[PDB]
Amino acid sequence: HHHHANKEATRNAAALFSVDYKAFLNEVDNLNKRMGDLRDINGEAGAWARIMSGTGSASGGFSDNYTHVQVGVDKKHELDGLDLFTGFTVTHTDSSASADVFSGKTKSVGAGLYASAMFDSGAYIDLIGKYVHHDNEYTATFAGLGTRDYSTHSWYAGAEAGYRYHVTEDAWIEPQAELVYGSVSGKQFAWKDQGMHLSMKDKDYNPLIGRTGVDVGKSFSGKDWKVTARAGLGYQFDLLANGETVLRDASGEKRIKGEKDSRMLMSVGLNAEIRDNVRFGLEFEKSAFGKYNVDNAVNANFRYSF
């Protein structure tokens, strides 16, 4: 036998109810990934779009890949040494996920509000609050669980601060720090295999994800364009794992607590300006050392300011 059975069901339940943690981690952004470069914009209003695509993996043969699409609009308030962008955003994500004992899909829709403060000194603050609804469909080739469709939703509150120090007229270093608090929801399956009631119930939980990093950049200019080459190194970490899956069965109840994960983040990219209205961001990024890693992903954003 019974101990081998219990370890197998724990590994598989952990893997499967894991996907909601990646459904939350996919929505974690940073200012530059979301909005692009917001420094020194003349227009008092803006509209922007973004697409991210990517893939990640963990043990048990877990790999996923997702496409995130996001748009927003804002007003920029011009204050003394401070541009404050206040706006709304809507998002859509399609992801797919698999592992040794399951596979399926997740569709997400979200909406939020942000404030981004760009200070003449080089300092920045980014604040965002959002809601994401997730429709999930996963099939398990294990304990006769079959196909299951379920909903979950997520609240997200994130705060980011950073300081761009200009090492030369055209080169810069930028330490950053970010904290993202969330409020993801539990699900419950009850079912019969071999004439025996089984069940799998996870509780509402609350991720806290921290990030600290440095970005570096080098810019090139003409009268009507700029391009900045940038690269970044960071450390991303759970500060909390308050999840708990409970598996119930004829014989008894077994509890499996959340585990923290952390990884090193790496990125390279460019930000472009063309004439007075158009900006464009692009980055390639991945992660090392986590139980879960982004193996490869790319993000593009486009801002039209007026």
Explained architecture:
This protein is mainly beta. It has a single domain, classed as Beta Barrel (Lipocalin), CATH 2.40.128. It has helices spanning 3-25, 31-35, and strands at 45-58, 62-79, 82-99, 102-119, 123-140, 146-163, 165-166, 171-182, 188-193, 196-202, 208-222, 225-238, 244-248, 254-257, 262-274, 278-288, 293-305. The chain has a twelve-stranded antiparallel barrel. A hairpin with a 3-residue loop joins strand 4 and strand 5.
Using DSSP, what is the number of strands? 17
Order of helices and strands: HHEEEEEEEEEEEEEEEEE
| Assembly state of the chains shown | monomer
Strand content: over 45%
Q: Could you say which overall geometry the principal axes of the C-alpha atoms support?
A: elongated
CATH class categorisation: Mainly Beta
CATH topology (fold) name: Lipocalin
Secondary structure class reads: mainly beta
Largest sheet: 12 strands, antiparallel, barrel
Strand order of the largest sheet: 1-2-3-4-5-6-8-11-12-15-16-17
Provide the domain count. 1
* Cα-atom radius of gyration: 22 Å
The amount of helix comes to: under 10%
Site (Cleavage): 29-30
Subcellular location: Cell outer membrane
Domain Autotransporter: 40-306
Protein name: Autotransporter protein EspP translocator
